[PDB]
Write a sequence for this structure.
């Protein structure tokens, strides 16, 4: 415990400055710089684009949005608490605010593309009833809540949640951007994916200051495991084919993105998946 | 736990249309007052600081040391309790923005110490007072907050007390420096910070409203006055505001005037009946 700089009770500087971890602080300031609120996203032109979508297209989009809306207390409680380094706590405090902005944003999008209130709950009944939500909740137990959960495991899990889970949905929404549809959804999507990446990178940097890093095998387990989940969700459950994407290519993007994390965490690739997408 | 503020019945998937336009308004209001430390120019202060007297510098530096050591702990109370315990989405959003703001506050108090306190006369000797104020505070905050015996209702009040009152004295002390026209940076950031704490006090009072089981006005009163008592001991004994040319009797009054204003806000009766002694306390940005 005390053997860890990030957890060491002696890292809670007197107040703060002057900064001791310039790298961690730079990320905080970055976050601070990319601050934004839902209101900033213009949803004015969207409805005409929405109505130009085919029935199967509207089913896929309205569903992923709801899944986004479903996902959202790892950041709030554990890491903004266990880590003692002030620079890091400033970053987590900001990640909390932003996560809430993501939620307002998704609610806002659903609320305008789906006017009928009864349709909204017909939509969420299906959602909180599906596999991706449970298979993910269960995954969080085996790696975040369990007692044998070392701090290094949770840092890895954390980086997977931000970088591995939902990576496919961002890609799918990006895919629609190439077809030039729904400006407001696409704009908020890059804003949110940028934030997620920034969060994925932070978790990495946190991993990097670790004395007690878990085994590469243990890592590979959390990473690919979650890859499995993300993969079946977009291949089998909410087939990306529904919007004209290639079910197999998606399976490969997710794998590329996962290798990228592993290599970002210092380890070596395990899928050897090239990036299927050009965007 | 028949509390609508703590029941999971707190929304599911889609937060609109808003159920509590009440809290939501404050969240938007909070978002609208977003600011960062780098927006406060401290480049005219140092020369100002130098022209100050031994006691004024002693008073100012210590007040900042106390702000410093506190604002950053006032987050382990939000993060680990109010941001989680509460289920109403609207409130969760507000507490999230408060957490951020509180951090900007610590940055500012550090930037200020770091700019006025030349060398490590600060980390060494300045900060060995962490003084009965800091102590009686912990006790106060750990008997009405950190303890299990304490309900959620009491905590909200102990919350509004740490925000509305616990440092109301120092904000006042700095507005005094403004009256005197000293330390532009320090005084402007105090305007900004005090406006935030103000919003944060109001919020707790709004939460209290939604509570269904409010402790007894005899309990809501035991917390606030045990606060006033600590605050007053601090600014009239430990660091007499006389150091910057202020009237102690009057500062003891102002503190009381505020504590009352907090009581009325939580829908109760005054216990001092104290008038506001400082005419300069009618300002801009508040
Ligand atoms: Fe995130
Ligand atoms: Fe503060
Ligand atoms: Fe505050």
């Amino acid at each position: 415990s005390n053997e860890e700089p990030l957890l060491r009770k002696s890292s809670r500087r007197f107040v703060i400055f002057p900064i001791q971890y310039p790298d961690i602080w730079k990320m905080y300031k970055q976050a601070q710089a990319s601050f934004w609120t839902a209101e900033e996203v213009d949803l004015s032109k969207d409805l005409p684009h929405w109505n130009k979508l085919k029935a199967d297209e509207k089913y896929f989009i309205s569903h992923i949005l709801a899944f986004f809306a479903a996902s959202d207390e790892n950041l709030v409680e554990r890491f903004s608490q266990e880590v003692q380094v002030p620079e890091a706590r400033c970053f987590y405090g900001f990640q909390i605010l932003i996560e809430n902005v993501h939620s307002e944003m998704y609610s806002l999008l659903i609320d305008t593309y789906i006017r009928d209130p009864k349709k909204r709950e017909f939509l969420f009944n299906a959602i909180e009833t599906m596999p991706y939500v449970k298979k993910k909740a269960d995954w969080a137990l085996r790696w975040i809540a369990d007692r044998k959960s070392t701090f290094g495991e949770r840092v890895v899990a954390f980086a997977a949640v931000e970088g591995v889970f939902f990576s496919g949905s961002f890609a799918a929404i990006f895919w629609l951007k190439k077809r030039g549809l729904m400006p407001g959804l696409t704009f908020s999507n890059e804003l949110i994916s940028r934030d997620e990446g920034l969060h994925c990178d932070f978790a990495c940097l946190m991993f990097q200051y670790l004395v007690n890093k878990p085994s590469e095998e243990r890592v590979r387990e959390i990473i690919v495991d979650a890859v499995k989940i993300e993969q079946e969700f977009l291949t089998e459950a909410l087939p990306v084919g529904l919007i004209g994407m290639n079910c197999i290519l998606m399976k490969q993007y997710i794998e590329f993105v996962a290798d990228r994390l592993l290599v970002e965490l210092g380890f070596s690739k395990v899928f050897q998946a090239e990036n299927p997408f050009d965007f």
In short: Residues A 95, 99, 162, 195-196, 199 surround fe (iii) ion (ligand 1) (CB under 6 Å).
